[PDB]
Write a protein that binds this ligand. Sequence first.
Ligand SMILES: CCCCCC(=O)N[C@H]1CCOC1=O
Length: 277
Amino acid sequence: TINYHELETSHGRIAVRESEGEGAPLLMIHGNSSSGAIFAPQLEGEIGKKWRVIAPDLPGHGKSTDAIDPDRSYSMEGYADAMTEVMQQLGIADAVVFGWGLGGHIGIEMIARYPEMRGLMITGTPPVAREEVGQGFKSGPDMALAGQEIFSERDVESYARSTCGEPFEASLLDIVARTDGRARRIMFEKFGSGTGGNQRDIVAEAQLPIAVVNGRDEPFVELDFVSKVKFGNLWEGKTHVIDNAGHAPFREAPAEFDAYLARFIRDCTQLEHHHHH
Ligand SMILES: CCCCCC(=O)N[C@H]1CCOC1=O
């Protein structure tokens, strides 16, 4: 019952999946070398049955084309531009946004570009200034692949297994193998070059509700660091941790993840929130 269609955008042709839900819209943004197909549990499950879930593929990812201009598109801020253009074409100005990994960093960059965003949930994403990368992320061989252009077959498998967690499915290899490797290299370099907004300052100053939900056994993100990040309006007043999940709780522990996501959507769309400045 998923509505699949493609949009011609200034970045290239962007693939979009939409759930059947009549309720408030939720944009879900996938991570590095993934695709919106990863959000099957939300798209096809109870979240997507109630709310209008939109899960696009970033340029260079999934069923989208490679970027027309990699130098423009393949960066946290460039992806944020692309997603903002997608939402404009879909006529949706006030989505709640969920971002996974790279997708969470993209969501942070979207705050300035998508002013009627009703909330942002980030999973697998430490808001960090460029000089804080070592504090926010755990060092390791799979983390090292995040910025590597060319993946071998073994790289594809290792990266898919670590980023997606249990259960591994063969379809994941196809998603990761497709990714335009230039996107990994350029996005990583540009983060290091400080090309976009300072994410630490952005989340500290943002007035919209920001929710933080992670798997307890995160292999990429330093949860203690994340629990100390200053947020302007931290949803439910703390960062949340789900047992028996790692980098991808939305698929590893869907029931528990969906409880948080559903409640966040309810809060962001049913309660008053004020911008005092
Ligand atoms: C340069 C900092 C890391 C960039 C963000 C990133 O690539 N995060 C990956 C890690 C696992 O899944 C992702 O999307």
